[model samples]
Each structure stands twice: as structure tokens, then as C-alpha cells.
Target: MPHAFKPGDLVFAKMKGYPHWPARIDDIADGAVKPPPNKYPIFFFGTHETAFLGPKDLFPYDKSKDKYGKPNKRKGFNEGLWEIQNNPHASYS
Candidate 1:
């Protein structure tokens, strides 16, 4: 079964080619207007025009995935996109 999510909840979303990437829920929208599609709410994340995923593309990240070393370009949003200084709930400890 898929995991249920809420606004502001921390989660991991799998990219089309990449797997187990982290992301946050920014907005949820329901009811499609133009093209016919599922009326389910859609979730959006990512900092810029880099990465964006839906529920089907999301997963939960484990603690092992967290890294404390210097940030690297190879890692995606899940490894460095955390807003620990801003969001209190983002603290891993």
C-alpha cells in the first residue's frame, strides 16, 4: 500500500530514473480542468526547475540515507534540500 501524506510532511519521492530521493509537500490541488485525468490531489516539490514528483513517484527515506559530510553535486534534493534552520520539524536528531 502507498503511504498517506499531509502538507508540510517530510517525504521521499522517486524520480523517473533516480530512486529514493527526498522531497517536501508544498501544495496539493484537486480536480483536473483541461485533459481528463484522475481527480486526485497532486503534490509539488523541489527548489527550482530541477525536480518535481507526484504521489506515485514518492517514497519514504530512511535514516541511513542522511549524510553529514560536505554536500556533493551527485546527491539530489533529499540529501541537501532540508530546511533545518527554518523548519523545526526538519531536524533529524
Candidate 2:
């Protein structure tokens, strides 16, 4: 069994070599190739990035305490993309 996630669920998703980042479930599907059981299409709240990740790399998110290095200092849920200060590769491209 895998993590049961539905669209719009806020989560913390980990990219290889990066800390867990804030994201939301956009959709779900099984891969056509190199399938990993199930795949989650997630949208990052901090960077406006998207990725397809499996259950193992994802967890529930807590905005106030989940930010890199320190807790998120902002108030309310805003959709604006924030820059990742610790990302060695400046561009999310």
C-alpha cells in the first residue's frame, strides 16, 4: 500500500538532493514506462515547480515549520512562488 493522496492535498515533496519542499497534489496516474507503482503530479508552492514523485518521497506539509533552514515567516496561504535560497542550481529549469 502507498500513501493515499488526493488532488489539492498539501504536502512536502522531496527532490533528489533537496530538502522537502511545499507542494500540492495536482493529479495522479500510473507511469507508462519505469512505473513506480503510482505517481503523483505535484505543484510546488514555494517555487511554482512541478514534479512527478512516488509515495516514498512525499509527506504532509506544515507551512510554519517546513521551510528550508527555518520556519516560513509569511502569513496566510499565498500562491506566489518564493525563491529557494539554498538551491545550488539557481534555476528550477
Candidate 3:
């Protein structure tokens, strides 16, 4: 049987070339808006495009420990705990 997924469930899929690319489920489809220009009729879904992770990419790096096991601070974007506001039409007149 196929595995059922939830909105926030972490899932992995292999792209054309890449192997086991990780992605968080953002939609489950129940009648929603379809953003312009598409090939598939499925509901739109996406993730932080910059995060090129995979199922095996799951890590437990200690925020309080550095490479040498010393104290360190967190870096980069915090997944699942932040908001990003944007104006897609801002570039147009």
C-alpha cells in the first residue's frame, strides 16, 4: 500500500537526477486555488526552494555545540518557525 502523508509530514522523492530529495508536505488537495501556468492539474505545493535536503539529510546537529564541541549559535533560516511576506506583483506596474 502507498504511504499516506499529512500537511507537515516530511517526505522524500527522487528527482530526475537527484536521489532521495527531502521535502515537507505542504498540501493534501481538497479543492484549492491553482496558480497560473501549470502542466499538472494538481493543487500547488512548495517548500523553501533553497533547502536541498533529503530523507537521509535529516540531522541532529546540536545548536549548543560547535565543530569542536564548543558553544555556538544557530545560523541560517529556521524551518517551520518563521514567516516570509512578499509581493509577487511588486515588480510589475
The list of candidate 2 runs beyond 4 A from truth reads: 1-3, 28-37, 62-93
- Considering only N, C-alpha and C atoms within 3 Å, which residue pairs clash in candidate 1? 12-59, 13-58
Instruction: Work out the TM-score per prediction.
Output: 0.42, 0.55, 0.29
- The list of candidate 1 runs beyond 4 A from truth reads 1-3, 28-46, 49-52, 62-72, 75-81, 84-93
**What digit string (tens of lDDT, one per residue) describes model 1 on residues 1-93?**
645665555555555564444445544337623322432222322232224445566444443246422243544343345442245144232
lDDT of 2 by residue, 1-93 (tens): 534887766666778866566666775346633324588777776566678888787776544234533444443123222433333223334
Task: Pick the winner on lDDT between candidates 2 and 3.
Answer: 2
In candidate 3, stretches whose alpha carbon ends up further than 4 angstroms from where it belongs are 1-3, 28-47, 50-93
lDDT of 1: 0.42
Ranking by TM-score: 2, 1, 3
Pairs that collide, model 2: none
Report the CA-based lDDT of candidate 2 relative to the real structure.
Answer: 0.57
lDDT of 3 by residue, 32-58 (tens): 544343211211112244332333333
